[PDB]
From a paper:
Cytoplasmic dynein 1 (dynein) is the major minus-end-directed microtubule-based motor in eukaryotic cells. Here, we show that a conserved amphipathic helix within the unstructured C-terminal region of the [name] ([name]) interacts with diverse dynein–dynactin effectors. The dynein LICs, comprising two closely related isoforms ([name] and LIC2), consist of two domains—an N-terminal GTPase-like domain that interacts with the dynein heavy chain11 and a less conserved and predicted unstructured C-terminal region, referred to here as the effector-binding domain.
Numbering used by the authors:
A (entry chain B): 441 to 454
B (entry chain A): 10 to 160
């Protein structure tokens, strides 16, 4: 589910 | 719940030396300690691993002794290296892990170890690896991270 990538990429962005 | 078994799959991606196929295989602490050494070998070093007894068998008292050392290490790591970013309000009940193989409390301990991996110096690579796992696992890992990172 691509939204999972938004979650993990958001962690990476911090 | 749904935590312990998804996090077991994640633990299995470390391919540590000790067996890690079942819930019971995690109850003596050795796998957890080996995973922590992989996460941060500068902190969870050989001197630290030496304190974890191997070949515990069914000795639940020794299981608990090992698990207390592991939890001590995690909590010290959180305080000294991670600036308290892991939420540690509810500690896993390691006595119930040893005495009853309680998979819910085991899931909580695995969640703390996940918290170490996604906040350590190699967090980018651990997160990138999670993003390759099965979607069902990733969703549980997502929920686990949300919980452990919240204040």
């Amino acid at each position: 589910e691509g939204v999972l990538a938004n979650f993990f990429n958001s962690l990476l962005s911090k | 719940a749904e935590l312990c078994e998804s996090l077991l799959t994640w633990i299995q991606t470390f391919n540590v030396d000790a067996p890690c196929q079942t819930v019971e295989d995690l109850t003596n602490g050795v796998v957890m300690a080996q995973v922590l050494q992989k996460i941060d070998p500068a902190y969870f070093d050989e001197n630290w691993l030496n304190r974890i007894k191997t070949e515990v068998g069914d000795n639940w008292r020794l299981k608990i002794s090992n698990l207390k050392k592991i939890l001590k290490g995690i909590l010290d790591y959180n305080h000294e290296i991670l600036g308290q970013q892991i939420n540690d309000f509810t500690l896993p009940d390691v006595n119930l892990i040893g005495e009853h193989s309680d998979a819910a409390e085991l899931g909580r301990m695995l969640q703390l170890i996940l918290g170490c991996a996604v906040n350590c110096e190699q967090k980018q690579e651990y997160i990138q690896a999670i993003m390759m796992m099965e979607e069902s696992v990733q969703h549980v890992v997502m929920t686990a991270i949300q919980e452990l990172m919240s204040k």
